[PDB]
Amino acid sequence: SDPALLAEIRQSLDATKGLTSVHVAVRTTGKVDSLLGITSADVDVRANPLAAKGVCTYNDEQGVPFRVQGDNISVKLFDDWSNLGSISELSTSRVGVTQLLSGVTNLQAQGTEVIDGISTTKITGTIPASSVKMLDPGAKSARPATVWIAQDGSHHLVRASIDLGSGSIQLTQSKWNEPVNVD
Ligand SMILES: CC/C=C/C/C=C/C/C=C/C/C=C/C/C=C/C/C=C/CCC(=O)O
Ligand SMILES: CC/C=C/C/C=C\C/C=C\CCCCCCCC(=O)O
Ligand SMILES: CC/C=C\C/C=C/C/C=C/CCCCCCCC(=O)O
Ligand SMILES: O=C([O-])CC(=O)C(=O)O
Ligand SMILES: [Zn+2]
Ligand SMILES: [Zn+2]
Ligand SMILES: [Zn+2]
Ligand SMILES: [Zn+2]
Ligand SMILES: [Zn+2]
Ligand SMILES: [Zn+2]
């Protein structure tokens, strides 16, 4: 809970909160059952009204079209859209992106790493189970996490990842404020 490292993470979360649009790439390793059966995605996101369109790997089927429209999270199988979940129902079920950052322990500045041609500050930390459950409802312990924060003046959250017991989730941002067509 180093105040300087926490401050730097808050800078990236505030930058994230201020985005009009962003491209998100989700990747996983091992076994992750907490993303409604999705294990990979590349998704264009519009922040307000929240809307998303892209592609995902769902139940091991690749190239599955993916959308968020209104309250619905949906995937297209063959010619048919089906709803995997509801935003409101997940929001009450699991419990904006300012998690209780106090609660985050053992912040460590690991130095500089280049991701997609961007120099980033790598900071590791430990996330309390209560916050981990928001991502993985079955989580029973505090888990290690990592964030990579651009050093270019933007404070972009270029990447964030969490090592869950059974697997890991990695989220990579790009295309900040580049226009998207999501409907
Ligand atoms: C090592 C310390 C870990 C601290 C916790 C890191 C939190 C990671 C948050 C994930 C990044 C957000 C997902 C990308 C989608 C961005 C769309 C913008 C809408 C969010 C606006 C809002 O929060 O109200
Ligand atoms: C890309 C894979 C999608 C799987 C997502 C399922 C779990 C997500 C983790 C917590 C969900 C937070 C719900 C969002 C809060 C409401 C946002 C809003 O209404 O603007
Ligand atoms: C420290 C945490 C690192 C893992 C990041 C979480 C990964 C995946 C869940 C977050 C949702 C990604 C955004 C996808 C579009 C937003 C609409 C939605 O699916 O809820
Ligand atoms: O919404 C999606 O991502 C898929 C849709 O069928 C398209 O326009 O290709
Ligand atoms: Zn310090
Ligand atoms: Zn992509
Ligand atoms: Zn995109
Ligand atoms: Zn059909
Ligand atoms: Zn789980
Ligand atoms: Zn930006």
Curated annotation (Swiss-Prot):
Keyword Signal annotated: yes
Transmembrane intervals: none
Keyword entries, A-Z: Cell membrane, Cell wall, Glycoprotein, Lipid transport, Lipoprotein, Membrane, Palmitate, Secreted, Signal, Transport, Virulence
PTM remark: Hexose glycosylated in N-terminus between residues 27 and 55; there may be 2 sugar moieties in this region, expressed in M.bovis.
Subcellular locations according to the entry: Cell surface; Secreted, Cell wall; Secreted; Cell membrane
One cellular-component annotation, GO: cell surface
Membrane-topology descriptor: Lipid-anchor
Superkingdom as given in the UniProt entry: Bacteria
GO biological process, one term: DIM/DIP cell wall layer assembly
GO MF term list: lipid transporter activity
Description of the deletion phenotype: No growth phenotype when grown in culture, no release of phthiocerol dimycocerosates (PDIM) to the culture filtrate. Attenuated virulence, about 80-fold less recovery of bacteria from lungs of 3 week infected BALB/c mice.
Domain notes: Forms a U-shaped beta-half-barrel with a large hydrophobic cavity (2835 Angstroms(3)) which is large enough to hold a single phthiocerol dimycocerosate (PDIM) molecule.
Family under the similarity heading: Belongs to the LppX/LprAFG lipoprotein family.
Role played: Might be involved in translocating phthiocerol dimycocerosates (PDIM) from the cell membrane to the outer membrane; PDIM forms part of the cell wall.
Designated name of the protein: Putative phthiocerol dimycocerosate transporter LppX
Origin species: Mycobacterium tuberculosis (strain ATCC 25618 / H37Rv)
Gene that this polypeptide is encoded by: lppX
